[PDB]
Design a protein around this ligand. Structure first.
Ligand code: CLA
Ligand SMILES: CCCCCCCCCCCCCCCCCC(=O)OC[C@H](CO[C@@H]1O[C@H](CO)[C@H](O)[C@H](O)[C@H]1O)OC(=O)CCCCCCCCCCCCCCCCC
Ligand code: HEM
Ligand SMILES: CC1=C(/C=C/C(C)=C/C=C/C(C)=C/C=C/C=C(C)/C=C/C=C(C)/C=C/C2=C(C)CCCC2(C)C)C(C)(C)CCC1
Ligand SMILES: CC1=C(/C=C/C(C)=C/C=CC(/C)=C/C=C/C=C(C)/C=C/C=C(C)/C=C/C2=C(C)CCCC2(C)C)C(C)(C)CCC1
Ligand SMILES: [Ca+2]
Ligand SMILES: [Ca+2]
Ligand SMILES: [Cl-]
Lengths: 243, 97, 137, 168, 56
């Protein structure tokens, strides 16, 4: 068993727990019992950004990016109710945890794409008739994506939403119409989608692990510009418990 | 047409009273008996369709119900403004002294 | 302006009684406040919780009311949250927690009376500055 | 001071507010504007004043601010020292009634809370009233500069930053 | 785009930038050192060494 001093500075703190290859079992679900996820962890391994289509209007693809904010990207210590529904499907309702990380990735050509990688208010459900969580189980769900910056955030000229100037004070007599989009901060709230594909199960401990893919918008800098579409891929871990 | 939603919200009852759905928790210090216990329950159980719905919060004492009734005149409700409630800003809005 | 007896006259209780503090009492109050309180309450604010200050109106709206000598002395013996609901001696300096807050150990009843007096008189002098924080420095 | 004197003299001779303010010459109103103050420029802000605030076209008229109770409110003017200045409205006696808050969370004086409105007398906007808070704020922001003018900012690609005059 | 030396770099196989793009429209390529930037830098350093040799 490892301590903080074993892990500190190694990068392991940003990694989700894994399960060995022998963990291909099944975790029995009792539709009479209540369940919870005690710890959900999401460790992104790849960030893809949808290229802004030239104007050919064909299929714009997701392209690779380089992480520049280091090992600060993982979601963890997430907990929430695991409902057993009438139809035998399971629904995870996220209640709390470290369920967001700001992330900046860099596109070919230098363009930096900040995003609020998140699963805030995640609601994800399995297929019906899940008597046991197996390596065939998956969760599909949606979550909220709030503004990358919150309402107090001030831009470099001191303008903000819940705080700040409401004009370009360095340009006292500039016509205000053309600066409106910059002057008037707006708070974004959009929806994201995530798939959790279970690859490993310890039927005894109640630990599951696998891969995820999520899709969400990036930062729109409080309404100053259009967000990019981001696809996040990685691995996850969850501990399921009687509660 | 671009609008600052917080400034706009100041033109509603939000600007005249404690909005149970939006106002930061420190505002409950303005009146006797609301902070921190009732303040916490109120913020935790938001949003409310009406002011009087604050009375239905589970586990409240009779004394608590009394204080709430005495202070309903100081409360309001408007639509939840994402900008004011995200980031946990209702618990800490970056304002101190 | 001067530190008149009128200025040093503060509510003793919620029932309309006042006490007139002596100049020595006021200076002692300032001294003891600096000693036991100012680490957190410099200028009337609260560094570990700026939401609650020591302004008279605020103390007045606390439960039980704290805008008088008896209330403040009681707070110094048995501190509560602003609504009076939980006792907080365990994380707040008091005679009751003088074991874990050693600077309270030698505070006398007279000392507490002095501190309370400083707390109520200061705003009558400094106005908005008291509990005002950096805005009013 | 001279503008107010003339307006008062007009009102005392039985003019309406509209008539009184419309009688104020545009040139006089134009003198009562900080963009013509020679102490508002910059060493490397080069060229004519028009390159900054624009080519003045017309006086919009005098802006009168009022709260929901109907009390007249007065915008605190920018002193020459300040590159930028807050927007603060007081009553006739200097008591604060309205402002543009920086932090909103404990705002008590927002134009929206105070239902601030603006009515124009004289100039292009004579007889018009605005009540929607964005526009009222916009005019208050211009009111910090004194009398409010319409500018051609396109002709010279004006950048909106005050420049000094040949006096300066 | 009025590019003059870029096509000559491309002609002999320099097609990518250190910043990750390539002139064929690929993304997330590693051109190694000999990107357009690497070629330019190499020429600048060469310029300097030739200057010193000229002095000698
Ligand atoms: C008394 C001298 C004087 C004055 C007061 C003016 C003033 C005016 N002229 Mg004018 N001008 C002048 C001489 C003067 N000019 C001369 C001699 C010429 C011929 C070159 C011109 C040519 C001219 C033109 C072509 C134009 C003007 C315009 C204008 C106006 C714009 C001012 C401006 O933007 O300056 C900007 C001033 C500066 C940026 C300050 C310069 C400071 C220098 C660079 C400092 C140098 C430091 C030094 C190197 C340090 C040495 C250190 C060493 C000892 C160790 C303005 C009303 C313009 C106008 O709007 O016309 C309609 C316009 O278009 N001027
Ligand atoms: C013989 C050879 C002569 C060659 C001249 C050498 C050129 C060097 C450059 C000179 C530096 C000044 C450049 C200013 C920038 C510029 O573009 O101005 C450009 C400005 C004109 O400004 C332009 O006007 C246009 C419309 O007419 C547009 O509006 C443009 O936006 C605007 O830039 O030119 C001038 O105004 C020059 C006059 C400056 C004189 C002011 C008097 C103050 C100087 C006294 C300081 C003494 C310091 C002594 C220290 C010891
Ligand atoms: C003799 C010493 C002190 C006295 C007399 C004093 C006085 C007071 C009073 C009267 C209040 C009630 C505020 C109100 O109702 O508006 C208060 C609140 C508070 N003070 Fe003190 N103060 C002292 C020292 C300290 C110290 C040393 C700390 C921190 C280390 C501290 C932290 C706090 C906190 C956290 C609160 C509010 C707690 C809550 O309501 O949850 N105080 N103080
Ligand atoms: C503005 C202009 C622009 C730009 C221009 C340019 C950019 C130019 C540059 C170019 C240059 C940049 C030139 C080059 C050069 C060089 C020279 C001509 C010099 C020389 C040599 C020599 C003289 C040296 C000597 C030496 C010494 C040093 C040492 C020892 C040895 C010897 C003696 C050899 C354009 C046109 C686009 C357009 C229009 C305008
Ligand atoms: C092979 C290799 C390469 C090629 C390379 C090149 C091409 C080289 C060149 C080199 C160079 C090109 C060098 C230069 C030189 C010389 C030197 C080493 C320097 C010098 C001199 C000096 C010593 C001077 C001194 C002084 C002066 C400073 C001044 C006056 C006085 C005197 C003169 C004294 C590549 C990349 C392709 C890749 C891989 C392979
Ligand atoms: Ca699977
Ligand atoms: Ca322009
Ligand atoms: Cl306060």
């Amino acid at each position: 068993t490892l301590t903080y001093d074993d892990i500190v500075g190694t990068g392991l703190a940003n990694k989700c727990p894994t399960l060995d290859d022998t963990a291909r079992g099944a975790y029995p679900i009792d539709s009479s019992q209540t369940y919870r996820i005690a710890r959900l962890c999401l460790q992104p391994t790849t960030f893809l950004v949808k290229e802004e289509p030239k104007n050919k209007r064909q299929e714009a693809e997701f392209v690779p990016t380089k992480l520049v904010t280091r090992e600060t990207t993982s979601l963890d210590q997430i907990q929430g109710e695991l409902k057993v529904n009438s139809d035998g499907s399971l629904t995870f309702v996220e209640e709390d945890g470290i369920d967001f990380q700001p992330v900046t990735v860099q596109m070919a050509g230098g363009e930096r794409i900040p995003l609020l990688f998140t699963v805030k208010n995640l609601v994800a459900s399995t297929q019906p008739n899940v008597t046991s969580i197996t390596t065939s189980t998956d969760f599909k769900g949606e979550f909220n994506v709030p503004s990358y910056r919150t309402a107090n955030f001030l831009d470099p000229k001191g303008r903000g939403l819940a705080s700040g100037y409401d004009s370009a004070i360095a340009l006292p007599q500039a016509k205000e119409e053309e600066l409106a989009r910059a002057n008037v901060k707006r708070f974004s709230l959009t929806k994201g989608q995530i798939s959790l594909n279970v690859a490993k199960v310890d039927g005894r401990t109640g630990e599951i692990a696998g891969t995820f893919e999520s899709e969400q918008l990036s930062d729109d800098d409080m309404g100053a510009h259009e967000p990019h579409e981001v696809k996040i891929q990685g691995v996850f871990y969850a501990s399921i418990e009687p509660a | 047409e671009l609008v600052n939603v917080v400034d706009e919200k100041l033109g509603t009852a939000y600007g005249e009273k404690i909005d149970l759905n939006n106002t930061n928790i420190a505002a409950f210090i303005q009146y006797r008996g609301l902070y921190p216990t009732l303040a916490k329950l109120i913020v935790k159980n938001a949003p409310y369709e009406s002011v009087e719905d604050v009375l239905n919060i589970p586990g409240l004492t009779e004394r608590q119900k009394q204080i709430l009734r005495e202070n309903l005149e100081h409360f309001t409700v408007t639509e939840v403004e994402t900008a004011l409630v995200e980031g946990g800003d209702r618990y800490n809005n970056g304002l101190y002294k | 302006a001067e530190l008149t007896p009128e200025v040093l006259t503060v509510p003793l209780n919620s029932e309309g009684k006042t006490i007139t503090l002596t100049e020595k009492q006021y200076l002692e109050g300032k001294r003891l406040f600096q000693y036991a309180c100012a680490s957190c309450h410099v200028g009337g604010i609260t560094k570990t919780n700026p939401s609650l200050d020591l302004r008279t109106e605020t103390l007045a709206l606390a439960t039980p009311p704290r805008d008088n000598i008896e209330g403040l002395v009681d707070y110094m013996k048995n501190p509560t949250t602003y609504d009076g609901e939980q006792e907080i001696a365990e994380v707040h300096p008091s005679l009751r927690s003088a074991d874990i807050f050693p600077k309270m150990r030698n505070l006398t009843e007279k000392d507490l009376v002095a501190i309370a007096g400083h707390i109520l008189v200061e705003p009558k002098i400094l106005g908005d500055k008291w509990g005002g924080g950096k805005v009013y420095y | 001071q001279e503008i107010n004197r003339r307006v008062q003299a007009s009102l005392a001779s039985g003019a309406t507010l509209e008539e009184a303010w419309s009688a104020i010459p545009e040139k006089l109103a134009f003198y009562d504007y900080i963009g013509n103050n020679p102490a508002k420029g910059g060493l490397f802000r080069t060229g004519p004043m028009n390159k900054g605030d624009g080519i003045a076209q017309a006086w919009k008229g005098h802006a009168v601010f009022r709260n929901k109770e109907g009390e007249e409110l007065f915008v605190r003017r920018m002193p020459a020292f300040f590159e930028s200045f807050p927007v603060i409205l007081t009553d006739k006696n200097g008591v604060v009634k309205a402002d543009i808050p920086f932090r909103r969370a404990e705002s008590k004086y927002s134009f929206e809370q105070q239902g601030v409105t603006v009515s124009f007398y004289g100039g292009e906007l004579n007889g018009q009233t605005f009540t929607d808070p964005p526009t009222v704020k916009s005019y208050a922001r211009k009111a910090i500069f004194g009398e409010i003018f319409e500018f051609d900012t396109e002709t010279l690609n004006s950048d909106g930053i005050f420049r000094t005059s040949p006096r300066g | 785009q009025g590019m003059f030396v870029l096509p000559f770099m491309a002609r002999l196989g320099v097609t990518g930038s250190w910043s990750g793009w390539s002139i064929t429209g690929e993304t997330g390529i590693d051109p190694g050192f000999w990107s357009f930037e690497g070629v330019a830098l190499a020429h600048i350093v060469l310029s300097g060494l030739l200057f010193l040799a000229a002095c000698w």
